[PDB]
């Protein structure tokens with residue numbers, strides 16, 4: 472058996488490296504939001520809370536991980552805090568991710584009522600609540616759901632731990648049934664699936680709105696040909712009554728509102744001509760709607776389409792964050808399920824256990840990178856902060 476300090480020297484070195492990268496990267500995220508007003512929106516206040524949890528992973532959780540890797544003697548309940556504090560940070564990260572998902576879904580469904588519903592004051596209140604709930608969920612083993620009353624006295628006596636002390640090891644003090652059912656299934660897996668559902672609703676909402684935009688645009692043009700090729704004024708009337716319905720519904724910034732008053736107004740003039748039996752007068756009047764189309768409606772069509780495909784891109788990037796979170800944390804969870812559900816399976820090897828632990832901590836390094844590559848606003852603010860200062 473190779474000396475244990477050798478493998479542990481690699482682990483601790485890798486742990487410290489990740490801590491540096493998690494602190495630096497997420498400190499850069501928080502500094503960009505504080506600095507750039509374009510990044511000071513409600514969505515980014517959850518990014519800041521998620522950035523705060525990653526900073527704390529390198530400042531506290533990783534130093535705690537290195538500690539518990541040594542099995543040092545400790546009062547079991549103090550050992551519990553060392554083991555479970557990271558479960559607080561990951562639980563807050565999940566609430567922050569979930570909050571972001573719901574934030575964008577409210578933005579895509581009811582943009583007109585978003586600014587009045589999702590305010591900064593309310594986001595701060597939600598963040599404060601989610602952290603309290605994160606501390607309660609993460610520190611639930613401290614409330615009694617622990618194996619401190621069932622100490623491994625064979626291991627405790629080995630390393631000469633005093634009265635009420637235990638060789639501080641994660642699996643000796645934290646009960647696996649909490650890790651699998653409560654922390655993974657209930658508190659991580661369920662919210663993650665909910666996030667999946669929310670983002671699938673964001674992409675569905677956007678796809679349906681881009682179909683609506685193109686459906687109303689094809690209606691304006693398809694049906695304009697119906698008037699050009701009309702034979703009687705009632706056919707020009709049956710066509711004009713559809714665009715006025717499609718125009719009033721599409722009306723739901725100063726000159727987009729202006730062009731829609733011209734369009735509905737022009738439809739009302741050609742519709743009146745059609746009611747008076749003026750088929751050709753209504754046709755010429757309807758040809759004036761093509762002036763309003765190009766000068767106004769064509770511009771609102773590329774503005775609403777651009778805003779929606781901006782929301783799809785932003786939603787994709789933010790979904791990549793949730794996927795990478797799952798990617799980095801699932802291995803640790805999945806191994807726990809094997810230790811728990813398969814007592815006949817040989818425990819995962821120590822090198823894989825700490826590879827999974829390291830992988831889970833690497834998630835605290837990746838988020839600043841996704842922002843620097845996907846969100847132009849964050850990227851430009853990073854190049855500005857770094858060119859100016861560091």
Ligand SMILES: CC(C)CCC[C@@H](C)[C@H]1CC[C@H]2[C@@H]3CC=C4C[C@@H](O)CC[C@]4(C)[C@H]3CC[C@]12C
Pocket residue numbers: 531544545546548549550552553
């Ligand atoms: C405000 C923050 C940043 C300060 C850091 C405080 C941390 C490091 C403190 C708070 C509670 C502390 C623990 C409380 C109890 C015990 C049991 C003892 O037998 C070994 C030390 C141990 C496990 C302590 C380790 C250090 C600890 C985790």
Ligand SMILES: CC(C)CCC[C@@H](C)[C@H]1CC[C@H]2[C@@H]3CC=C4C[C@@H](O)CC[C@]4(C)[C@H]3CC[C@]12C
Pocket residue numbers: 797798801802803805806809816817818819820823
């Ligand atoms: C989330 C994505 C990346 C998938 C991750 C799946 C990983 C964690 C899976 C794939 C194969 C799995 C291993 C398959 C078989 C064994 C042998 C058993 O005696 C202990 C568990 C152990 C060692 C498993 C641990 C978890 C494992 C490594």
Ligand SMILES: CC(C)CCC[C@@H](C)[C@H]1CC[C@H]2[C@@H]3CC=C4C[C@@H](O)CC[C@]4(C)[C@H]3CC[C@]12C
Pocket residue numbers: 801805808809812813
């Ligand atoms: C996020 C998505 C992937 C859902 C997560 C599915 C998880 C919970 C699944 C994927 C693989 C599964 C494991 C596959 C094999 C075994 C060995 C068996 O003797 C006990 C159950 C156990 C240990 C399963 C537990 C549940 C498990 C870990």
Ligand SMILES: Nc1nc(NCCc2ccc(O)cc2)nc2nc(-c3ccco3)nn12
Pocket residue numbers: 558640641642650803804807818821824825828
């Ligand atoms: N099972 C587990 N173990 C550890 N550390 C102990 C590694 C170990 C496991 C077995 C052994 O004989 C010696 C050492 N940290 C752990 N963290 C988690 C975890 C955190 C979040 C979700 O799962 N699970 N987990």
Ligand SMILES: CCCCCCCC/C=C/CCCCCCCC(=O)O
Pocket residue numbers: 596599600603604
């Ligand atoms: C609001 C921060 C205070 C601590 C929150 C405790 C979290 C546990 C309770 C969860 C239910 C939601 C809490 C809402 C309390 C404030 C309600 C309000 O004043 O509008």
Ligand SMILES: CCCCCCCC/C=C\CCCCCCCC(=O)O
Pocket residue numbers: 529530531533534535537538541543544
């Ligand atoms: C901003 C400060 C960040 C943290 C600074 C301290 C980092 C030191 C690294 C890990 C702490 C490990 C302490 C030693 C473990 C206990 C030793 C033992 O009991 O055997």
Ligand SMILES: CCCCCCCC/C=C\CCCCCCCC(=O)O
Pocket residue numbers: 548602603606607610611613614
């Ligand atoms: C960001 C800060 C959020 C507010 C933090 C305070 C909320 C605390 C919530 C519940 C704590 C439950 C754990 C109590 C364990 C006590 C330790 C022990 O058992 O000895």
Ligand code: NA
Pocket residue numbers: 531532535536552553554555556557558
């Ligand atoms: Na911890």
